[PDB]
Each structure stands twice: as structure tokens, then as C-alpha cells.
């Protein structure tokens, strides 16, 4: 009837890719985060920001290419193309590291626009919105690492660059400087990721091994029409199996599939709380009862004090080349070496 | 009628509370001895010379540790790969000093887990099930035997084996990074994709079932009570969750077949952990990951740094600091 | 030297929430024994 | 007072969800104790 109704009926039309209202936020912003990454890893260097090479023009393969974080002198500037740093020039915008905030900002509005996509399709199909709530897990890892972690730090420079090996140094930068593995929020996150991979490997292998005979063929994939009301696997058998192997087992398909939602997602929320606590440098660095004892008793050694000496090697050896803006000129005689290494 | 037939009828009975089976004849004595020695060695066990340099590393709770720092320490560098039981130790005090209980726990563990795996086969035979849950459990058995058995073999000592603890795990992972460069190795890459993908398709499948549940309860009681146990009606509209994901990405990327869907949940992690556990295995024999250090040069020939060179300087920090007294010669051959 | 307020953190972090979850189970079984009408309802 | 509330309901917790919630508290007590004692 009205003008709003014609636009509402056009976006929600059955077509190849469902656009909806949320596609106006997703499809422009996701196309430019992805294309900003493919351009930045192919053409744009890191020679002026980090003093590296992170492009395909500079000989890096898929692994050692990245869209890199800007300089520490930029601080937390948004680095707009028209801004006071770039001033409209495209070429000087790329050399400062403007594509990285271009990827991260238009990417953050892609994950907004993709989670709104999951509320919109669920309302048209008419189902409960648990996909949009389980996808809030990965939103809490993008925001609290690519956004909330460099905000608490000195600049955008201490953020993960969007490249394969550039994530890998961020894994190593976070052990030596922060002792991230000791943090109980990672420990509750590893329990959800390795726990979530566990549940789909079991529920994959128990459904597929309690199937009913619905055909004479040896292939069991053929014997399932999608609109049938009979269940395709014996729940009573699978309960009787695991009650004797493992001792305790699900007797509820509604509780089972909810539990496959809770376990992976909670590991992304609990691990997201800790990385917000490392923006503020509130790290779980030391057990002081272990540290006061190892200072007074020069014979008491645990595995825990062995990890601190591994972190002095990370804090001293890479920090010269890690942070060229700070100009660490270490002598050879201050770098902690071991015996004969 | 015979005594053996009345014993085979009991040991293979599915009417027991826990199925014992013929693999339980060597699962249960193995894993209860790995357990009962682990609880004692984690709580009350004296310090252990791990580096073979007579610098004993404390690992138990009574010697001032906690849950995180306490760990069953691996055996000595002095022993190395030699089999060191209690009777070949001339006292228990000489046994506990040189890293005794690490070999008693690990060898009774790998026998009991390889028997827990065959026990999952056996009950599937006696219940009429198709058999292959135990093939999915091969993937953590591959990974448990990689860090406790295969990596001490190729490195030639159980002292390079994984410490049974929590802080000892991260001593194992970091030293393995400096000496082998696991992150650049494509088999750790193929299993990070296995568990990121595994936790994806777990929470992606578990949401689309819970989204499309059928009304069987009221708003006061729980959602879960609309499933009566052993019912024959399907508890969720699978056509509904197919039409949702058929619009969320596109139409042809959606499994309408629930059997092929529930197979892909078992394929992706298990193949990802088979491949990963043969990353530790091929890096047990010093076939390390990629090494792109000093790979990008200018026309003058000066080395231009990459992200691998920054990653190298993190590896050089752990390499020059791990086992800071055990080395005497310029190259860590072990 | 350990913090002496951590004993109060842990042993009340165990007992107070765990004794809470016991109570929701005991009154659950009491309502089921309450409706059932035999020998235990009173 | 006034009349009885028609919004009175009952709270349930089966034996299954007891052991989840007990094990949830003890494992969080095992995990976070070492940091609190410092």
C-alpha cells in the first residue's frame, strides 16, 4: 500500500540471496572488510609502520602476509581517509596503516549486520532465535580482541594484524608479556573449544552408529527422506551404550542439542572476559607465594618458575624488533642467555 | 555348565551395570593403577631430577604447590629412554628421585586407553550397533600417544615427554615451539581448523535443533520436558531448520539429509586430530614446520623482515632459555 | 605467605552455592512426594 | 494483606541438574582457588 510496504515486500522477496533489511548493513560492510583484507595483504606494505614486509608484492606467501596495525605515533586515531592524518590522500593512508582500521571498523559493522540477519530470517521462518544468540559468542571475541584490547593498550599497534603469521606473533606476544595461558579465563575457554569439538565428534559418531535399517543398500546415506516423522536413530540404544561405557549419558534430545550450544559458546564468553582484563594489564602473572619462596630458597624449583624464565626470553629477545618505535637498543650482554646457547 | 562358560557369560554380559568385556580385563587393572599412582604422585611425591643435572624439580602438593603448578614430573635425562620399573631401581627412594612414577603412570595409561577404545567396540558388537564409535575415539588416542610415547621416542628420552600437570603442559608447548616451530607446521594448522571448525559445527547444529523445537510444553515448565524418553515421534521440524540455513547462506549449502549432516560432525574434528597428532609425530623426528626466516631480500641483498622474523625472535627467546643449565654445547640436538 | 581471605573465598564459594543447589533438589522431591499421597505426604 | 497471588509457581530441579550444578561449583572452586590463595 504505502511506500514503506513496497520496500518491505521487496527486500523480503524469495530470491537467490536473502537481502532483507539487514542486508543493507551487512552486504556493504562485509564486502569492504573482505576486499580490504585481500587488497591489504596483496599490495599494501608494512614498511613504514612496523618495518616489515607483509604483502605479496614483497615476496610474502599466504602465511607471512598481513594487513598490519598502524604506528604507535598514530595512537588510537580512527585514521579516516579524510582525517587529519591521511588528509584525503589514498596512498599516504595505506602507508600509515589506514586499511587496518578500515578492515576492523567495516568488519565490526559486518558482525553487527550479520547477527541482525539471524534475527530477521528467524522471524520470517518463524523459529526461536538461538542462532543469533550463539553467534554472539564470536562477536565477543572480535570485539574484545580486535577492538577492546588495543583501546586499553597504548595504541592500535598492539592489536592483532589480519594475517596468518601476524596472529601467530600475537599468540607469542601474549605469553611473554602477559602470561595469558595462566589466566583462568583462557582455561575456561580451552575447555569450551576442546569441549565443543568433543561433543560434535561424539554426537556425530553416535547418531551415525545407531541408525535404523530403512533400506536394503549398504549405503545408509540414501535411506533418509527429509520430511519423515520417524526418528532416524535409536535413542534408547545410544543411551544404553554410553550408560555402560562412560557411566552417564543423555536421555533427552532437547537437552543434548542445547548442551551442544552452551559448551562452545560459553568458552568464547569466558575467554572474552579475560582479554578485557588484559587491556588493563590486570594479568595473572605470578603466584606470590611461589615467588617469595623461590627468592628466599635458591633450590626450590617448580614447572611454574620454569615458565617465567621462558618469558624473560620472550620479553627481551623479540622486544628489540617488536617495537621499533621505542628504539630498544639492547647490548649483547643484557640479553638473558642460558648456558652455551 | 562349565566354570569358564559361566565366567564368559558374566564378563560379556550387557546386563552388568558397567560393561566389562574382554578389553576390560586389561582396561580396569591398567587404568586403576594409573589412577591410584597418579593421585599419590600428584599429592605426595618428592622432587625429581628431570634435567639429569641433580637439580630436583618439585611437582607435588605437599612440597608447596597448587593445582596449577603441581605436576607429575617426567623421568630423568639420565635414564632417558630406558625402561625403569620399581624392581630395577634398588630402592623406592632411588625410584622416586629419578622420575619413577612418570613411567608407571604413562605406560599403564596408554594400555588402558587403547583398551578403553577396544571396549567401545566390543559393546557395540553385543548391542547390535554399527561399530565405529571407537574409530572416532582413535583421534585423542593418537594425540595421547603422540606426546607421551612417540615424542619421547624420537627425541630419545622420556624427559622430553609431557609433564602430567597444568603448568607442565605450557612448559611443554612453549619449548616445543622454539625447537620445532609447530605453528608454521601445516598439521597444527589442520587441527586448529579441526577444533575451531568442530566448535563451530557443534554450536551451529545445536542451535538449529533448539531453534526448531515443536510445542509440547507450557511457558511455565522447562523446554526440555517436551521430549519423553524413548518416544518415536520426531522432536523438531527438520524442514524448518533446513529452510532457515537455506536462506542464511544460500540454498545449496544446506544438508537436507540428517544422516549426512550427523556424519560431517564426526568427520571434521576427527580428521583434524588424526592429522594434528601426526604433526607431533613427524616433529618428534625433527622434521620441523616451515622456516621463512631471511626469505625476503632487496636487490642489494639486505634482509627485509617479515612476520616470520618477528616470530623467529620469539622462538630464539625460548630456545636460549629452556633447560638453562642442561646444555653444554652450542646446538640443542635434543 | 598466602592471603587469609582466600580461605573464606573458597570455602564459602564452595559451600554456600552448593548448599543452595541441594535445597532446590530436596524441595523438588518433596513436591513429588507431596502430590503422590502415600506414606510421605503428611 | 490482600488476596492470594495467582502467579504462584513451583520450582523444580531434578537429580540430573543437581550433579551438573555441584560439579560446576567444585570445578570452579578447583580452578580459581590457586589464584585466590596467590
Amino acid at each position: 500500500r504505502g511506500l514503506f510496504d513496497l520496500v518491505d515486500d521487496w527486500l523480503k522477496k524469495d530470491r537467490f540471496v536473502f537481502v532483507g533489511w539487514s542486508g543493507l548493513l551487512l552486504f556493504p560492510t562485509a564486502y569492504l572488510a573482505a576486499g580490504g583484507w585481500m587488497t591489504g595483504t596483496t599490495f599494501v606494505t608494512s614498511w613504514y609502520t612496523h618495518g616489515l614486509a607483509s604483502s605479496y608484492l614483497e615476496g610474502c606467501n599466504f602465511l607471512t602476509a598481513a594487513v598490519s596495525t598502524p604506528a604507535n605515533s598514530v595512537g588510537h586515531s580512527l585514521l579516516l581517509l579524510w582525517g587529519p592524518e591521511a588528509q584525503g590522500d589514498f596512498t599516504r593512508w595505506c602507508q600509515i596503516g589506514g586499511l587496518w582500521t578500515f578492515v576492523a571498523l567495516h568488519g565490526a559493522f559486518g558482525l553487527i549486520g550479520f547477527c541482525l540477519r539471524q534475527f530477521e530470517i528467524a522471524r520470517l521462518v518463524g523459529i526461536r532465535p538461538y542462532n543469533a544468540i550463539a553467534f554472539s559468542g564470536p562477536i565477543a571475541v572480535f570485539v574484545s580482541v580486535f577492538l577492546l584490547y588495543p583501546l586499553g593498550q597504548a595504541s592500535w599497534f598492539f592489536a592483532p594484524s589480519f594475517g596468518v603469521a601476524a596472529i601467530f606473533r600475537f599468540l607469542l606476544f601474549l605469553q611473554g608479556f602477559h602470561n595469558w595461558t595462566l589466566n583462568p579465563f583462557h582455561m575456561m575457554g580451552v575447555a569450551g573449544i576442546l569441549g565443543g569439538a568433543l561433543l560434535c565428534a561424539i554426537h556425530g559418531a553416535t547418531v551415525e552408529n545407531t541408525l535404523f535399517e530403512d533400506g536394503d543398500a549398504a549405503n545408509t546415506f540414501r535411506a533418509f527422506t527429509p520430511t519423515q516423522s520417524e526418528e532416524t536413530y535409536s535413542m534408547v540404544t545410544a543411551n544404553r551404550f554410553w550408560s555402560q561405557i562412560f557411566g552417564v549419558a543423555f536421555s533427552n534430545k532437547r537437552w543434548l542439542h542445547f548442551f551442544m550450544l552452551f559448551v562452545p559458546v560459553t568458552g568464547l564468553w569466558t575467554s572474552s572476559i579475560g582479554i578485557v582484563g588484559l587491556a588493563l594489564n590486570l594479568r595473572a602473572y605470578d603466584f606470590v607465594s611461589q615467588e617469595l619462596r623461590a627468592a628466599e630458597d635458591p633450590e626450590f624449583e617448580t614447572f611454574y618458575t620454569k615458565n617465567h624464565l621462558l618469558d624473560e626470553g620472550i620479553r627481551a629477545w623479540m622486544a628489540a624488533q617488536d617495537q621499533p618505535h621505542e628504539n630498544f637498543v639492547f647490548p649483547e650482554e643484557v640479553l638473558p642467555r642460558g648456558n652455551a646457547l | 555348565v562349565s566354570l569358564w562358560e559361566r565366567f564368559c557369560a558374566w564378563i560379556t554380559s550387557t546386563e552388568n551395570r558397567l560393561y566389562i568385556g574382554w578389553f576390560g580385563c586389561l582396561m580396569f587393572p591398567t587404568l586403576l593403577t594409573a589412577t591410584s599412582c597418579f593421585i599419590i604422585a600428584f599429592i605426595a611425591a618428592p622432587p625429581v631430577d628431570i634435567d639429569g643435572i641433580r637439580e630436583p624439580v618439585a611437582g607435588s602438593l605437599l612440597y608447596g604447590n597448587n593445582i596449577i603448578s603441581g605436576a607429575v614430573v617426567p623421568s630423568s635425562n639420565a635414564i632417558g629412554m630406558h625402561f625403569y620399573p620399581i624392581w630395577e631401581a634398588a630402592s623406592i627412594d632411588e625410584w622416586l628421585y629419578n622420575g619413577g612414577p612418570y613411567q608407571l603412570i604413562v605406560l599403564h595409561f596408554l594400555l588402558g586407553v587403547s583398551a578403553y577404545m577396544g571396549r567401545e567396540w566390543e559393546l557395540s558388537y553385543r548391542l547390535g550397533m554399527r561399530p565405529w564409535i571407537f574409530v572416532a575415539f582413535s583421534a585423542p588416542v593418537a594425540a595421547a600417544s603422540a606426546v607421551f610415547l612417540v615424542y619421547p621416542i624420537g627425541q630419545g628420552s622420556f624427559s622430553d615427554g609431557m609433564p602430567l600437570g597444568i603448568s607442565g603442559t605450557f612448559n611443554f608447548m612453549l619449548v616445543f615451539q622454539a625447537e620445532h616451530n609447530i605453528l608454521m607446521h601445516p598439521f597444527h594448522m589442520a587441527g586448529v581448523a579441526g577444533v575451531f571448525g568442530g566448535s563451530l559445527f557443534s554450536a551451529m547444529h545445536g542451535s538449529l535443533v533448539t531453534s526448531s523445537l515443536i510445542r509440547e510444553t507450557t511457558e511455565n515448565e522447562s523446554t526440555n520436558y517436551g521430549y519423553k524418553f524413548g518416544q518415536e515421534e520426531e522432536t523438531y521440524n527438520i524442514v524448518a531448520a533446513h529452510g532457515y540455513f537455506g536462506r542464511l547462506i544460500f540454498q545449496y549449502a544446506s544438508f537436507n539429509n540428517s544422516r549426512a549432516l550427523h556424519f560431517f560432525l564426526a568427520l571434521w574434528p576427527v580428521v583434524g586430530i588424526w592429522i594434528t597428532s601426526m604433526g607431533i609425530s613427524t616433529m618428534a623426528f625433527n622434521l620441523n614446520g616451515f622456516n621463512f626466516n631471511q626469505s625476503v631480500v632487496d636487490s642489494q641483498g639486505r634482509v627485509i623482515n617479515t612476520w616470520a622474523d618477528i616470530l623467529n625472535r620469539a622462538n630464539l627467546g625460548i630456545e636460549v632459555m629452556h633447560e638453562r643449565n642442561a646444555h653444554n654445547f652450542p646446538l640443542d640436538l635434543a | 605467605e598466602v592471603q587469609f581471605g582466600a580461605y573464606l573465598a573458597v570455602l564459602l564459594g564452595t559451600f554456600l552455592p552448593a548448599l543452595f543447589l541441594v535445597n532446590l533438589f530436596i524441595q523438588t522431591e518433596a513436591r513429588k512426594a507431596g502430590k503422590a499421597g502415600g506414606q510421605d505426604s503428611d | 494483606m490482600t488476596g492470594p497471588n495467582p502467579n504462584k509457581q513451583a520450582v523444580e530441579l531434578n537429580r540430573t541438574s543437581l550433579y551438573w550444578g555441584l560439579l560446576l561449583i567444585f570445578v570452579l572452586a578447583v580452578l580459581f582457588s590457586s589464584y585466590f590463595f596467590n
Binding site: 552417564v248 | 524418553f229 | - | 560439579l23
Partner: peptide, 30 residues
């Protein structure tokens, strides 16, 4: 004195594992 709490948390965790396996609410059809 400090390790006494850690031991009580560990064997207390193994108690509720014991009760969950053997005293489980046995599911029944009908």
C-alpha cells in the same frame, strides 16, 4: 595448611563423580 584445601577440593570433586555414575536417575520408557 594451604595444600589441605586443594586436596579437599580434589577428593570432593571425585565424590560427586561417584554419585553421578551409580546413583543416577535411571531413565525409563513409559
Amino acid at each position: 595448611m594451604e595444600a589441605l584445601v586443594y586436596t579437599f577440593l580434589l577428593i570432593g570433586t571425585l565424590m560427586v563423580i561417584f554419585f553421578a555414575v551409580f546413583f543416577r536417575e535411571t531413565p525409563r520408557i513409559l
